[PDB]
Short mmCIF file of C-alpha atoms and ligand atoms in Angstrom, two decimals:
data_model
loop_
_atom_site.label_atom_id
_atom_site.label_comp_id
_atom_site.label_asym_id
_atom_site.label_seq_id
_atom_site.Cartn_x
_atom_site.Cartn_y
_atom_site.Cartn_z
CA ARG A 1 18.48 -9.89 8.83
CA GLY A 2 16.45 -9.09 5.83
CA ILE A 3 13.29 -11.07 4.97
CA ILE A 4 10.89 -11.61 2.18
CA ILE A 5 7.68 -9.72 2.20
CA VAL A 6 4.89 -10.58 -0.01
CA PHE A 7 1.85 -8.15 -0.66
CA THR A 8 -0.94 -10.24 -2.60
CA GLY A 9 -4.75 -10.63 -2.74
CA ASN A 10 -7.49 -8.72 -4.74
CA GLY A 11 -7.93 -5.52 -2.74
CA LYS A 12 -6.19 -2.16 -3.48
CA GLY A 13 -2.92 -1.86 -1.41
CA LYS A 14 0.06 -3.82 -2.25
CA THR A 15 2.20 -1.65 -4.21
CA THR A 16 1.18 1.18 -2.01
CA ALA A 17 2.35 -0.96 1.00
CA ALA A 18 5.53 -1.85 -0.61
CA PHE A 19 5.94 2.04 -1.26
CA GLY A 20 5.08 3.00 2.41
CA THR A 21 7.74 0.32 3.66
CA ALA A 22 10.36 1.87 1.18
CA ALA A 23 9.45 5.40 2.53
CA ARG A 24 9.58 4.19 6.02
CA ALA A 25 13.23 2.82 5.17
CA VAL A 26 14.28 6.07 3.31
CA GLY A 27 12.94 7.69 6.15
CA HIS A 28 15.50 5.76 8.62
CA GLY A 29 18.58 6.51 6.24
CA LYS A 30 18.41 3.10 4.66
CA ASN A 31 19.09 2.34 0.93
CA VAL A 32 16.32 1.10 -1.41
CA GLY A 33 16.31 -0.09 -4.96
CA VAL A 34 12.78 -0.82 -7.08
CA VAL A 35 11.96 -2.77 -10.03
CA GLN A 36 8.67 -2.26 -11.46
CA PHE A 37 7.44 -4.93 -13.74
CA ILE A 38 4.47 -2.98 -14.99
CA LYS A 39 4.49 0.35 -17.21
CA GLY A 40 1.86 2.77 -15.65
CA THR A 41 0.30 5.37 -18.48
CA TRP A 42 0.29 7.69 -15.81
CA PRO A 43 2.98 9.45 -14.07
CA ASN A 44 4.55 7.56 -11.42
CA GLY A 45 4.09 9.61 -7.94
CA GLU A 46 6.09 7.06 -5.88
CA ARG A 47 8.67 7.20 -8.31
CA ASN A 48 8.48 11.38 -8.15
CA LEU A 49 8.80 11.36 -4.44
CA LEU A 50 11.39 8.71 -3.76
CA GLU A 51 13.64 8.94 -6.73
CA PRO A 52 14.76 12.52 -5.89
CA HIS A 53 15.70 10.79 -2.41
CA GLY A 54 18.21 8.51 -3.65
CA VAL A 55 15.93 5.81 -4.66
CA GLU A 56 16.56 3.75 -7.86
CA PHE A 57 13.83 2.81 -10.13
CA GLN A 58 14.07 0.44 -12.85
CA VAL A 59 10.66 0.19 -15.04
CA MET A 60 9.45 -2.20 -17.61
CA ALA A 61 9.76 -1.04 -21.16
CA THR A 62 6.77 0.51 -22.61
CA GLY A 63 4.42 -1.45 -24.79
CA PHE A 64 4.15 -4.67 -23.07
CA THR A 65 1.46 -6.57 -25.08
CA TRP A 66 0.22 -9.45 -22.55
CA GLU A 67 -0.33 -11.48 -25.80
CA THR A 68 0.20 -14.99 -26.55
CA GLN A 69 2.20 -14.33 -29.92
CA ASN A 70 4.21 -11.69 -28.79
CA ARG A 71 5.28 -13.46 -25.61
CA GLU A 72 8.95 -13.55 -27.35
CA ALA A 73 9.31 -9.69 -27.22
CA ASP A 74 7.10 -9.46 -24.09
CA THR A 75 9.69 -11.72 -22.51
CA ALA A 76 12.89 -10.34 -23.42
CA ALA A 77 11.82 -7.15 -22.06
CA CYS A 78 10.87 -9.15 -18.95
CA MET A 79 14.26 -10.42 -18.78
CA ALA A 80 15.48 -7.31 -19.55
CA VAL A 81 14.14 -5.75 -16.41
CA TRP A 82 14.73 -8.83 -14.77
CA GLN A 83 18.27 -8.17 -14.82
CA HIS A 84 18.39 -4.77 -12.70
CA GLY A 85 16.35 -7.07 -10.46
CA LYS A 86 19.44 -9.61 -10.64
CA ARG A 87 21.65 -6.61 -9.71
CA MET A 88 19.70 -5.13 -6.94
CA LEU A 89 19.53 -8.82 -5.24
CA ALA A 90 22.95 -9.11 -5.05
CA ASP A 91 24.00 -5.32 -4.13
CA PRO A 92 25.29 -5.30 -0.54
CA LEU A 93 24.43 -1.85 0.16
CA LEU A 94 20.94 -2.03 -0.82
CA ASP A 95 18.71 -2.63 2.36
CA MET A 96 15.71 -3.30 0.50
CA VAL A 97 14.61 -4.00 -2.87
CA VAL A 98 11.29 -3.78 -4.15
CA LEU A 99 9.81 -5.95 -6.89
CA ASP A 100 6.67 -4.67 -8.00
CA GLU A 101 4.39 -7.02 -9.91
CA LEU A 102 6.58 -9.58 -10.12
CA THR A 103 3.67 -12.06 -9.71
CA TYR A 104 2.23 -11.83 -13.14
CA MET A 105 5.80 -12.04 -14.40
CA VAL A 106 6.12 -15.65 -12.71
CA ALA A 107 2.62 -16.49 -13.63
CA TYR A 108 2.56 -16.27 -17.03
CA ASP A 109 5.97 -18.02 -17.78
CA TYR A 110 7.43 -14.62 -18.72
CA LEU A 111 10.16 -14.85 -15.66
CA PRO A 112 11.57 -18.27 -14.91
CA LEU A 113 10.79 -19.06 -11.09
CA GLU A 114 14.08 -20.60 -10.57
CA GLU A 115 15.57 -17.44 -11.55
CA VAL A 116 13.51 -15.41 -9.04
CA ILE A 117 14.13 -17.96 -6.65
CA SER A 118 17.95 -18.30 -6.62
CA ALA A 119 18.33 -14.68 -6.81
CA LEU A 120 16.10 -14.65 -3.47
CA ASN A 121 17.83 -16.90 -1.83
CA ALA A 122 21.54 -15.76 -2.78
CA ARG A 123 20.53 -12.24 -1.26
CA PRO A 124 22.41 -10.27 1.39
CA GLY A 125 21.79 -11.68 4.70
CA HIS A 126 20.53 -8.38 5.82
CA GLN A 127 18.47 -7.43 2.53
CA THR A 128 14.62 -7.12 2.69
CA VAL A 129 12.60 -7.98 -0.45
CA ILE A 130 8.92 -6.70 -0.93
CA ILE A 131 7.08 -8.51 -3.80
CA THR A 132 3.61 -7.56 -4.77
CA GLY A 133 1.02 -8.53 -7.17
CA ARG A 134 -2.06 -10.78 -7.96
CA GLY A 135 -1.56 -14.67 -7.65
CA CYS A 136 1.95 -15.22 -6.37
CA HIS A 137 3.62 -18.55 -6.90
CA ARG A 138 3.33 -21.22 -4.37
CA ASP A 139 6.97 -21.75 -4.04
CA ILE A 140 7.34 -17.89 -3.41
CA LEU A 141 4.77 -17.80 -1.10
CA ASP A 142 6.84 -20.40 0.77
CA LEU A 143 10.01 -18.89 0.47
CA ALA A 144 8.33 -15.70 1.95
CA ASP A 145 8.99 -14.81 5.48
CA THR A 146 5.99 -12.32 5.57
CA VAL A 147 2.81 -12.32 3.62
CA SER A 148 -0.25 -10.55 3.56
CA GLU A 149 -3.55 -10.81 1.63
CA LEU A 150 -5.37 -7.72 0.83
CA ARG A 151 -8.73 -8.95 0.94
CA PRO A 152 -11.33 -7.19 -0.99
CA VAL A 153 -14.00 -6.11 1.34
CA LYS A 154 -14.97 -3.22 -0.43
CA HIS A 155 -13.68 -1.11 -3.38
CA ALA A 156 -14.68 2.45 -4.49
CA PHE A 157 -14.77 1.57 -8.11
CA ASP A 158 -17.51 -0.88 -7.72
CA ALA A 159 -19.62 2.11 -6.14
CA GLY A 160 -18.88 4.11 -9.50
CA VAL A 161 -15.95 5.98 -8.37
CA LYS A 162 -13.50 6.81 -11.11
CA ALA A 163 -9.68 6.14 -10.79
CA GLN A 164 -8.01 9.37 -9.87
CA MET A 165 -4.62 10.76 -9.44
CA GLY A 166 -3.36 10.59 -5.98
CA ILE A 167 -5.58 7.56 -4.96
CA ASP A 168 -5.21 5.22 -7.62
CA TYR A 169 -2.01 6.40 -9.70
CA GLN B 1 -11.50 -14.69 -31.04
CA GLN B 2 -14.74 -12.94 -30.08
CA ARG B 3 -13.86 -13.70 -26.41
CA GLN B 4 -11.29 -11.13 -26.32
CA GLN B 5 -13.64 -8.19 -27.75
CA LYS B 6 -15.92 -9.85 -25.21
CA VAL B 7 -13.79 -8.68 -22.05
CA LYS B 8 -12.61 -5.87 -24.11
CA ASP B 9 -16.12 -4.39 -24.08
CA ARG B 10 -16.88 -5.52 -20.38
CA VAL B 11 -13.64 -3.40 -19.18
CA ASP B 12 -14.76 -0.32 -21.41
CA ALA B 13 -18.18 -0.50 -19.98
CA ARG B 14 -17.35 -0.83 -16.60
CA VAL B 15 -14.73 2.02 -17.06
CA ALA B 16 -17.15 3.93 -19.06
CA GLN B 17 -19.64 3.55 -15.74
CA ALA B 18 -17.45 4.94 -12.92
CA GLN B 19 -17.51 8.28 -13.82
CA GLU B 20 -17.98 9.77 -10.33
CA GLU B 21 -15.32 11.46 -8.58
CA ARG B 22 -14.75 12.59 -5.48
CA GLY B 23 -12.62 12.08 -2.22
CA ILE B 24 -12.96 8.62 -0.72
CA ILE B 25 -12.99 6.74 2.71
CA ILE B 26 -10.33 4.14 2.53
CA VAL B 27 -10.03 1.53 5.30
CA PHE B 28 -6.85 -0.64 6.17
CA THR B 29 -7.84 -3.24 8.26
CA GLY B 30 -6.94 -6.89 9.57
CA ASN B 31 -4.06 -8.64 11.47
CA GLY B 32 -1.50 -8.81 8.86
CA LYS B 33 1.19 -6.53 8.39
CA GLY B 34 0.68 -3.65 5.95
CA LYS B 35 -2.03 -1.38 7.47
CA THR B 36 -0.22 1.75 8.39
CA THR B 37 2.49 1.06 5.36
CA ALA B 38 -0.57 1.49 2.67
CA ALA B 39 -1.60 4.33 3.91
CA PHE B 40 1.85 6.17 3.64
CA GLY B 41 2.44 4.43 0.21
CA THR B 42 -0.65 6.21 -0.91
CA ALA B 43 0.12 9.30 1.06
CA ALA B 44 3.53 9.22 -0.90
CA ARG B 45 1.84 8.73 -4.13
CA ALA B 46 -0.46 11.93 -3.59
CA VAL B 47 2.81 14.08 -2.66
CA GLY B 48 4.61 12.68 -6.02
CA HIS B 49 1.31 14.22 -7.75
CA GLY B 50 1.38 17.92 -5.88
CA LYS B 51 -1.45 16.71 -3.89
CA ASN B 52 -1.95 18.13 -0.20
CA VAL B 53 -1.95 15.70 2.78
CA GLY B 54 -2.36 15.46 6.41
CA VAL B 55 -1.73 12.85 8.92
CA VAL B 56 -2.64 12.03 12.39
CA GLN B 57 -0.98 9.21 14.41
CA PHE B 58 -3.36 7.49 17.30
CA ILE B 59 -0.12 5.60 18.68
CA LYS B 60 3.09 6.98 19.59
CA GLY B 61 6.02 4.35 18.66
CA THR B 62 8.98 3.36 20.66
CA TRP B 63 11.06 4.64 17.57
CA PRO B 64 11.93 7.27 15.24
CA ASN B 65 9.12 8.03 12.29
CA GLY B 66 10.81 7.12 8.91
CA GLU B 67 7.76 8.27 7.27
CA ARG B 68 7.52 11.45 9.29
CA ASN B 69 11.25 11.91 8.56
CA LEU B 70 10.67 11.60 4.90
CA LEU B 71 7.19 13.09 4.48
CA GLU B 72 7.13 15.90 6.88
CA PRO B 73 9.60 18.07 4.93
CA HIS B 74 7.32 17.86 1.52
CA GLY B 75 4.69 19.66 3.75
CA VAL B 76 2.93 17.07 5.24
CA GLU B 77 1.81 17.74 8.72
CA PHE B 78 2.02 15.27 11.37
CA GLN B 79 -0.15 15.31 14.41
CA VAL B 80 1.19 12.72 16.82
CA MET B 81 -0.05 11.15 20.10
CA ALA B 82 1.94 11.97 23.42
CA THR B 83 4.15 9.91 24.98
CA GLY B 84 3.31 7.45 28.02
CA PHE B 85 -0.20 6.60 26.95
CA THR B 86 -1.54 3.77 29.47
CA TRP B 87 -3.77 1.55 28.15
CA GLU B 88 -4.85 1.19 31.90
CA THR B 89 -8.44 1.97 32.83
CA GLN B 90 -7.50 3.43 36.28
CA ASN B 91 -5.90 5.96 33.75
CA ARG B 92 -8.39 6.56 31.24
CA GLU B 93 -9.04 10.40 32.13
CA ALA B 94 -5.58 10.97 31.24
CA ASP B 95 -5.38 8.61 28.10
CA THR B 96 -8.51 10.04 26.89
CA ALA B 97 -7.30 13.57 27.40
CA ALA B 98 -4.41 12.85 25.05
CA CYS B 99 -6.68 11.44 22.64
CA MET B 100 -9.04 13.89 22.08
CA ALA B 101 -6.00 16.30 22.02
CA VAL B 102 -4.64 14.32 18.63
CA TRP B 103 -8.41 14.39 17.75
CA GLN B 104 -8.53 17.88 17.26
CA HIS B 105 -6.05 18.11 14.75
CA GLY B 106 -7.62 15.66 12.80
CA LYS B 107 -10.82 17.47 13.07
CA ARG B 108 -8.86 20.33 11.75
CA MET B 109 -7.53 18.49 8.73
CA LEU B 110 -10.89 16.90 8.01
CA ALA B 111 -12.20 20.35 7.94
CA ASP B 112 -9.56 21.91 5.59
CA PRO B 113 -10.17 22.01 1.94
CA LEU B 114 -6.70 22.49 0.96
CA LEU B 115 -5.85 18.75 2.04
CA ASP B 116 -6.35 16.07 -0.57
CA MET B 117 -5.85 13.59 1.95
CA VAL B 118 -6.24 12.72 5.33
CA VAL B 119 -4.53 9.76 7.44
CA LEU B 120 -6.11 8.74 10.60
CA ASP B 121 -3.41 6.18 12.01
CA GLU B 122 -4.54 3.70 14.11
CA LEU B 123 -7.71 5.26 15.05
CA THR B 124 -9.63 2.09 15.17
CA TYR B 125 -8.59 1.56 18.96
CA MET B 126 -9.24 4.77 19.65
CA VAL B 127 -12.74 4.24 19.01
CA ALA B 128 -12.80 0.70 19.87
CA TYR B 129 -11.68 1.47 23.59
CA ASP B 130 -14.02 4.34 24.01
CA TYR B 131 -11.19 6.60 24.00
CA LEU B 132 -12.84 8.61 21.23
CA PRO B 133 -16.60 8.75 20.29
CA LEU B 134 -17.78 7.34 17.25
CA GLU B 135 -20.24 9.66 16.45
CA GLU B 136 -17.73 12.51 16.25
CA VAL B 137 -15.50 10.55 13.88
CA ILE B 138 -18.58 9.69 11.89
CA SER B 139 -19.71 13.21 11.50
CA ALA B 140 -16.45 14.76 11.00
CA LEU B 141 -16.03 12.23 8.16
CA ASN B 142 -19.31 13.52 7.11
CA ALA B 143 -18.46 17.11 6.92
CA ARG B 144 -15.00 16.87 5.40
CA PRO B 145 -14.05 18.44 2.17
CA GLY B 146 -15.99 16.51 -0.83
CA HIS B 147 -12.70 15.98 -2.91
CA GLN B 148 -10.88 14.94 0.47
CA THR B 149 -10.08 11.45 0.90
CA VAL B 150 -9.49 9.72 4.29
CA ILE B 151 -7.69 6.65 5.07
CA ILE B 152 -8.24 4.96 8.29
CA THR B 153 -5.81 2.40 9.66
CA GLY B 154 -5.81 -0.49 12.24
CA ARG B 155 -7.08 -3.65 13.42
CA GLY B 156 -10.72 -4.30 14.46
CA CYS B 157 -12.65 -1.17 13.08
CA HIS B 158 -16.19 -0.24 13.86
CA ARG B 159 -18.72 -1.50 11.48
CA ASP B 160 -20.22 1.86 11.27
CA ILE B 161 -16.91 3.32 9.94
CA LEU B 162 -16.39 0.19 7.99
CA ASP B 163 -19.71 1.17 6.57
CA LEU B 164 -19.32 4.79 5.63
CA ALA B 165 -16.13 3.48 4.04
CA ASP B 166 -15.55 3.72 0.32
CA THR B 167 -12.81 0.86 -0.02
CA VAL B 168 -11.94 -1.67 2.75
CA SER B 169 -9.13 -3.76 2.48
CA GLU B 170 -8.43 -6.55 5.13
CA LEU B 171 -4.99 -7.77 5.61
CA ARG B 172 -4.87 -11.39 6.30
CA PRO B 173 -1.94 -12.54 7.75
CA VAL B 174 -0.74 -15.42 5.87
CA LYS B 175 2.48 -15.51 6.89
CA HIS B 176 4.37 -13.12 9.62
CA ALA B 177 8.40 -13.47 10.52
CA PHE B 178 7.53 -12.70 13.87
CA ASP B 179 5.79 -15.86 14.43
CA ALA B 180 8.73 -17.39 12.99
CA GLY B 181 11.17 -15.75 15.79
CA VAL B 182 12.05 -12.76 13.49
CA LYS B 183 12.24 -9.64 15.61
CA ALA B 184 11.21 -6.14 14.60
CA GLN B 185 13.39 -4.09 12.67
CA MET B 186 14.22 -0.27 11.06
CA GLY B 187 12.78 0.47 7.96
CA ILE B 188 10.51 -2.68 8.08
CA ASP B 189 8.65 -2.87 11.51
CA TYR B 190 9.06 0.80 12.09
C1 B12 C 201 -5.68 -6.83 -11.74
C2 B12 C 201 -5.92 -6.20 -12.92
C3 B12 C 201 -5.04 -6.59 -14.03
C4 B12 C 201 -4.32 -7.93 -14.18
C5 B12 C 201 -5.49 -9.06 -14.55
C6 B12 C 201 -5.37 -10.54 -14.38
C7 B12 C 201 -5.38 -11.01 -12.72
N1 B12 C 201 -6.37 -10.68 -12.24
O1 B12 C 201 -4.47 -11.50 -11.99
C8 B12 C 201 -3.44 -7.67 -15.06
C9 B12 C 201 -2.16 -7.26 -14.47
C10 B12 C 201 -2.87 -9.03 -16.10
C11 B12 C 201 -3.78 -6.46 -15.90
C12 B12 C 201 -3.01 -6.18 -16.85
C13 B12 C 201 -3.50 -4.88 -17.48
N2 B12 C 201 -4.34 -3.99 -17.14
CO1 B12 C 201 -5.59 -4.22 -15.69
N3 B12 C 201 -6.52 -4.48 -14.10
C14 B12 C 201 -6.55 -4.92 -13.12
C15 B12 C 201 -7.88 -4.62 -12.40
C16 B12 C 201 -6.86 -3.91 -11.17
C17 B12 C 201 -8.65 -5.48 -11.71
C18 B12 C 201 -9.48 -6.33 -12.66
C19 B12 C 201 -10.28 -7.46 -12.32
O2 B12 C 201 -10.00 -7.98 -11.56
N4 B12 C 201 -11.54 -7.18 -12.54
C20 B12 C 201 -12.83 -8.02 -12.02
C21 B12 C 201 -13.13 -8.99 -12.68
C22 B12 C 201 -13.83 -10.08 -12.07
O3 B12 C 201 -13.75 -8.68 -14.24
P1 B12 C 201 -13.21 -9.09 -15.21
O4 B12 C 201 -13.98 -8.16 -16.29
O5 B12 C 201 -13.29 -10.21 -15.65
O6 B12 C 201 -11.53 -8.60 -15.25
C23 B12 C 201 -10.52 -8.80 -16.56
C24 B12 C 201 -10.22 -7.67 -17.32
O7 B12 C 201 -10.02 -6.67 -16.08
C25 B12 C 201 -8.76 -8.49 -17.65
N5 B12 C 201 -7.84 -7.48 -17.82
C26 B12 C 201 -7.10 -6.71 -16.63
N6 B12 C 201 -6.52 -5.33 -16.93
C27 B12 C 201 -6.99 -5.24 -18.22
C28 B12 C 201 -7.20 -4.09 -18.94
C29 B12 C 201 -7.58 -4.30 -20.40
C30 B12 C 201 -7.50 -3.10 -21.40
C31 B12 C 201 -7.93 -5.36 -20.90
C32 B12 C 201 -8.65 -5.48 -22.03
C33 B12 C 201 -8.37 -6.39 -20.22
C34 B12 C 201 -7.67 -6.47 -18.80
O8 B12 C 201 -8.27 -9.11 -16.26
C35 B12 C 201 -9.48 -9.57 -15.72
C36 B12 C 201 -9.68 -11.15 -15.77
O9 B12 C 201 -9.84 -11.52 -17.31
C37 B12 C 201 -8.22 -3.70 -13.00
C38 B12 C 201 -8.87 -2.24 -12.20
C39 B12 C 201 -10.25 -2.01 -12.62
N7 B12 C 201 -10.79 -1.01 -12.08
O10 B12 C 201 -10.97 -2.59 -13.27
C40 B12 C 201 -7.32 -3.21 -14.29
C41 B12 C 201 -7.62 -2.40 -15.49
C42 B12 C 201 -8.62 -3.20 -16.15
N8 B12 C 201 -6.49 -2.79 -16.23
C43 B12 C 201 -5.78 -1.76 -17.01
C44 B12 C 201 -4.67 -1.95 -17.58
C45 B12 C 201 -4.76 -0.58 -18.46
C46 B12 C 201 -3.89 -2.94 -17.66
C47 B12 C 201 -2.86 -2.94 -18.88
C48 B12 C 201 -2.90 -2.56 -20.08
C49 B12 C 201 -1.51 -2.55 -17.61
C50 B12 C 201 -0.40 -2.17 -18.64
N9 B12 C 201 0.06 -1.22 -18.37
O11 B12 C 201 0.21 -3.22 -19.13
C51 B12 C 201 -2.99 -4.65 -19.16
C52 B12 C 201 -3.53 -5.23 -19.95
C53 B12 C 201 -4.10 -6.56 -19.89
C54 B12 C 201 -5.25 -6.50 -21.06
N10 B12 C 201 -5.91 -7.68 -21.20
O12 B12 C 201 -5.52 -6.07 -21.86
C55 B12 C 201 -6.89 -0.64 -16.92
C56 B12 C 201 -7.52 -0.73 -18.10
C57 B12 C 201 -7.85 0.67 -18.96
C58 B12 C 201 -9.01 0.91 -19.97
N11 B12 C 201 -9.71 2.00 -19.70
O13 B12 C 201 -9.10 -0.12 -20.78
C59 B12 C 201 -7.58 -0.86 -15.40
C60 B12 C 201 -9.08 -0.57 -15.93
C61 B12 C 201 -7.14 -0.26 -14.39
C62 B12 C 201 -6.76 1.16 -14.69
N12 B12 C 201 -5.50 1.53 -14.94
O14 B12 C 201 -7.85 2.12 -14.46
N13 B12 C 201 -4.62 -5.94 -14.98
N1 ATP C 202 -9.74 -4.46 -5.89
C1 ATP C 202 -9.54 -3.48 -6.97
N2 ATP C 202 -10.50 -2.74 -7.59
C2 ATP C 202 -10.18 -1.66 -8.75
N3 ATP C 202 -8.95 -1.14 -8.90
C3 ATP C 202 -7.92 -2.03 -8.33
C4 ATP C 202 -8.22 -2.84 -7.40
N4 ATP C 202 -7.12 -3.04 -6.74
C5 ATP C 202 -6.24 -2.20 -7.17
N5 ATP C 202 -6.75 -1.85 -8.22
C6 ATP C 202 -6.38 -0.26 -8.96
O1 ATP C 202 -5.84 -1.38 -10.11
C7 ATP C 202 -4.43 -0.67 -10.49
C8 ATP C 202 -3.43 -1.64 -10.15
O2 ATP C 202 -3.42 -1.91 -8.95
P1 ATP C 202 -2.75 -3.65 -8.61
O3 ATP C 202 -4.08 -4.55 -9.29
O4 ATP C 202 -1.58 -3.81 -8.80
O5 ATP C 202 -3.30 -3.21 -7.03
P2 ATP C 202 -2.36 -2.81 -5.70
O6 ATP C 202 -1.18 -2.89 -5.70
O7 ATP C 202 -3.05 -3.07 -4.72
O8 ATP C 202 -3.13 -1.00 -6.00
P3 ATP C 202 -2.32 0.09 -5.05
O9 ATP C 202 -1.15 0.60 -6.02
O10 ATP C 202 -3.29 1.34 -5.05
O11 ATP C 202 -1.95 -0.16 -3.87
C9 ATP C 202 -4.21 0.60 -9.59
O12 ATP C 202 -4.36 1.76 -9.98
C10 ATP C 202 -4.94 0.11 -8.38
O13 ATP C 202 -5.22 1.02 -7.35
N1 ATP C 203 0.51 -9.40 12.29
C1 ATP C 203 1.66 -9.07 13.02
N2 ATP C 203 2.62 -9.82 13.67
C2 ATP C 203 3.88 -8.84 14.00
N3 ATP C 203 3.96 -7.79 13.93
C3 ATP C 203 2.98 -6.73 13.26
C4 ATP C 203 1.83 -7.40 12.73
N4 ATP C 203 1.26 -6.61 12.13
C5 ATP C 203 1.98 -5.55 12.32
N5 ATP C 203 3.08 -5.56 12.96
C6 ATP C 203 3.92 -4.75 13.89
O1 ATP C 203 3.42 -3.92 14.68
C7 ATP C 203 3.49 -2.52 14.54
C8 ATP C 203 2.27 -1.88 13.94
O2 ATP C 203 1.13 -2.72 13.84
P1 ATP C 203 -0.20 -2.36 13.18
O3 ATP C 203 -1.29 -3.00 13.81
O4 ATP C 203 -0.68 -0.91 13.39
O5 ATP C 203 -0.26 -3.34 11.82
P2 ATP C 203 0.61 -2.39 10.35
O6 ATP C 203 -0.03 -0.95 10.48
O7 ATP C 203 -0.45 -3.24 9.15
O8 ATP C 203 2.09 -2.23 10.35
P3 ATP C 203 2.91 -1.70 9.55
O9 ATP C 203 3.01 -0.36 10.01
O10 ATP C 203 4.24 -2.40 9.47
O11 ATP C 203 2.42 -1.68 8.15
C9 ATP C 203 4.35 -2.49 13.53
O12 ATP C 203 5.95 -2.54 14.08
C10 ATP C 203 4.38 -3.69 12.58
O13 ATP C 203 4.97 -3.83 11.59
MG1 MG C 204 0.34 -2.65 -7.47
MG1 MG C 205 0.09 0.52 11.94
#
């Protein structure tokens, strides 16, 4: 029996948590797939470590604008990642799927809510989905079985600490 | 319009401001699921870049350690807690002994300049239940290498620790499958 897990809120740790569950699952001989809806500038350590173990990663094409005019381009691209996402949510050998930073995809109308939804509902009874990102659709939140709020009690960057490899990316 | 630049300028400035760079303390607290899991994801992220990490776990689970399994071989040392810890008052000596034992190693990692990251998993209940002295932890944290990052995990973390900590995130249980009758599972729960 898989569940839906959502990691949301402003504190640091959502993507990190999705990964640790993924790691945890990989450490149990489990099969996992990852879709990232956002293109980091930097190299991807989680990827670097897990891809070799058998973890598939589909990332968002580079140059996503976040811009109104460009919403068409910007969308195709989203819709293009969402495919792999569709695929993984239909793969029966996949014990777990990570949908990194979907939230904004739904939130800005880039990825239709219904898509995600249906895709979620129709997934393998035994498959676990972990969704992350700030501001997750109320529908999602409701469909979700587990949900955690990373309350921003404190953050290093506020104290003048630069983002650094290993911690931040 | 100019709003765009407005923000543009803001970010740039904020970013421009935060130049410091050293190892930080990170706390993962609250009742919601995700404390231990986010520490490990960060560890994992670190390894992914060649960084060196050391882990200490204050609690010994019922099942196999997926994280350990996966991370040890990459050269991530795991110092775990002995089987049979009682949470029994009657047996505080035995439990305390055990504790202090795991604590050595942690003290060790905390002292190693080679480690870029130290993970003290479920340390909160050790201090909170008096099985381990706070000043100790506070000191160790105080001495540790200046590029070393620590991540502490668990519910109900000493303010002092909270206070020393650089970033703190409290996992609020919006929802939890358990309450909904879902049982614990492999790769997920443990
Ligand atoms: C959360 C966040 C976002 C969210 C913001 C919306 C939301 N809250 O739901 C989303 C995902 C949309 C976003 C996207 C992007 N982000 Co961002 N964002 C973050 C983060 C973690 C928090 C910002 C925040 O909430 N600050 C506090 C609020 C109170 O202050 P604010 O000034 O009003 O914050 C606004 C801006 O930060 C804006 N925004 C968010 N990110 C960025 C990046 C740029 C370049 C700009 C101009 C604006 C922008 O969103 C906030 C709301 O308007 C910061 C991390 C950090 N250390 O700052 C990164 C950060 C600001 N983002 C970063 C990046 C690079 C981007 C993206 C380019 C990511 C990508 N690869 O596509 C895009 C670009 C969007 C844009 N406006 O240009 C960088 C910018 C680097 C730089 N030197 O300019 C930062 C500093 C993170 C990092 N990598 O160090 N991000
Ligand atoms: N509250 C915050 N203040 C500053 N930077 C943040 C904060 N939360 C996350 N970040 C950093 O902003 C980038 C985008 O992270 P995101 O907003 O998706 O948070 P996250 O998923 O919780 O972060 P992380 O991946 O470290 O777990 C990351 O480099 C991340 O570490
Ligand atoms: N609020 C909760 N309800 C039910 N089970 C929980 C809850 N929080 C955590 N768990 C489960 O309890 C065990 C460890 O609990 P802990 O207090 O350390 O939280 P955690 O560090 O956030 O959990 P995890 O390791 O899943 O990320 C795990 O099996 C864990 O998934
Ligand atoms: Mg993230
Ligand atoms: Mg834990």
